[PDB]
C-alpha cells in the first residue's frame, strides 16, 4: 500500500536528516560555490532532493530509497579529500544512518 509506505519513508527521511548535524547534506551542493562538481559526480543527491523524489513517487520500494541515501554518502567521499570536514561528516552520516535504515527496512518488510 503506497500511502503507508510513503508515510514511513517520510518519517525515515526525517530521522536521517536529523543525523546531518552539520547541515552539510540538506540541499544540493551549490554549483555557484563548487563549479566543477558535475565533472566528477554523475548523480548528485541530498535530502531536499530525496524529499522531492519521495513526493514524486520515485521511491516505490525501500531499496531505491536506501540507494539514494547511500549516494549522498558515496558522492561526498568521492568528491572531497579525506582530510576535509565534508568527507569526515559523510563517514559519520553513514555510521549514524545505519541503524535508522535497518529499523525502517524491517518496518517496510512488515507491510
Amino acid at each position: 500500500q503506497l500511502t503507508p509506505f510513503l508515510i514511513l519513508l517520510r518519517k525515515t527521511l526525517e530521522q536521517l536528516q536529523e543525523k546531518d548535524t552539520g547541515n552539510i547534506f540538506s540541499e544540493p551542493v551549490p554549483l555557484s560555490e563548487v563549479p566543477d562538481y558535475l565533472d566528477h559526480i554523475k548523480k548528485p543527491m541530498d535530502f531536499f532532493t530525496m524529499k522531492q523524489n519521495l513526493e514524486a513517487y520515485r521511491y516505490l520500494n525501500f531499496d531505491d530509497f536506501e540507494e539514494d541515501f547511500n549516494l549522498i554518502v558515496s558522492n561526498c567521499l568521492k568528491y572531497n579529500a579525506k582530510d576535509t570536514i565534508f568527507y569526515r561528516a559523510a563517514v559519520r552520516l553513514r555510521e549514524q544512518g545505519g541503524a535508522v535504515l535497518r529499523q525502517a527496512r524491517r518496518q517496510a518488510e512488515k507491510m
Binding site: 552539520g22 566543477d36 568528491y79 579529500a81 576535509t84 570536514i85 565534508f86
Partner: peptide, 8 residues
C-alpha cells in the same frame, strides 16, 4: 583530484 569546497 577536484577543485574542492571552501573550508566550512
Amino acid at each position: 583530484s577536484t577543485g574542492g569546497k571552501a573550508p566550512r
